[PDB]
Design a protein around this ligand. Sequence first.
Ligand SMILES: Fc1ccccc1C1=Cc2ccccc2C2=NCCN12
Ligand SMILES: Fc1ccccc1C1=Cc2ccccc2C2=NCCN12
Length: 301
Amino acid sequence: FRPISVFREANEDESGFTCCAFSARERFLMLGTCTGQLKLYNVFSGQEEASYNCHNSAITHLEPSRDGSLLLTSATWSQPLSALWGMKSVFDMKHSFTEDHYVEFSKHSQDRVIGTKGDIAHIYDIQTGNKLLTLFNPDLANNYKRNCATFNPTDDLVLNDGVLWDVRSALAIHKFDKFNMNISGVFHPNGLEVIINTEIWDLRTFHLLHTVPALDQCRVVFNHTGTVMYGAMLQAMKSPFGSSFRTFNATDYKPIATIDVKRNIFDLCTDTKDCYLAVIENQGSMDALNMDTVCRLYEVG
Ligand SMILES: Fc1ccccc1C1=Cc2ccccc2C2=NCCN12
Ligand SMILES: Fc1ccccc1C1=Cc2ccccc2C2=NCCN12
């Protein structure tokens, strides 16, 4: 993990980066801030290129669309809580998702959003904004405190609150048992496995394949090719993770590295070419008057 670049929010005695994601434009990182701003930075020079006020509370999440035309955001205590922005010529609000605390794009064909409200997953048409599906069954719920609904890599299955759902039928096909209070899980990119906290489940048999105790309370991100997996552990403003990230071989779940940066982590994300990891670190402690985050850029391959 060769450090390539570091930078703080321009013209701020208190740097307030809270999340990041590479833009579809090579060389440029998108960051959310604690004042609800979207910033475009050159990742190598640290130069601020653009700024827009998306929300009047802190950004918690953002996801750019792979064609470079759309952007999802989620805030903290804003109504609306999440939104979809156009970035073709003018930066403008397309649609808002009043109470959804988290949103993603579909993966294969990026023609939907999926948004999460507590235990309840909402699927929307991007062109109309219209709500096509509510996926929720009160008898199968796990009530995960950090539930994040997500599409599989072909868009035909949804994981919501530890329940696998067929989309076309709008039926629940399997409830994974609850083994932690917080993490609800993600699809591997290979379409065959589900990662729910420390449990890796087969999608063909619903058997446990692997136990990975190091993944406990981690948010997980894959490289583009899906051969490497990075995890940063939640804490037991306030930094959402601790000071260390783990990296795993994505095909057998054997550890490659444990990095302590010695500074609490807000986010981490991968470029499209499996070259870089970008990490938001806080230089302050939680007790500090204010935040002081940087972005670091690491060569990996
Ligand atoms: F915890 C989460 C679970 C699922 C999705 C997003 C988050 C999250 C919460 C958060 C809270 C305060 C400041 C920054 C963040 C943040 N930045 C990127 C990830 N993230
Ligand atoms: F096996 C099952 C028994 C009962 C209900 C469903 C399944 C199942 C779900 C699935 C989901 C995503 C990818 C592959 C699969 C799969 N492969 C074999 C069977 N199977």
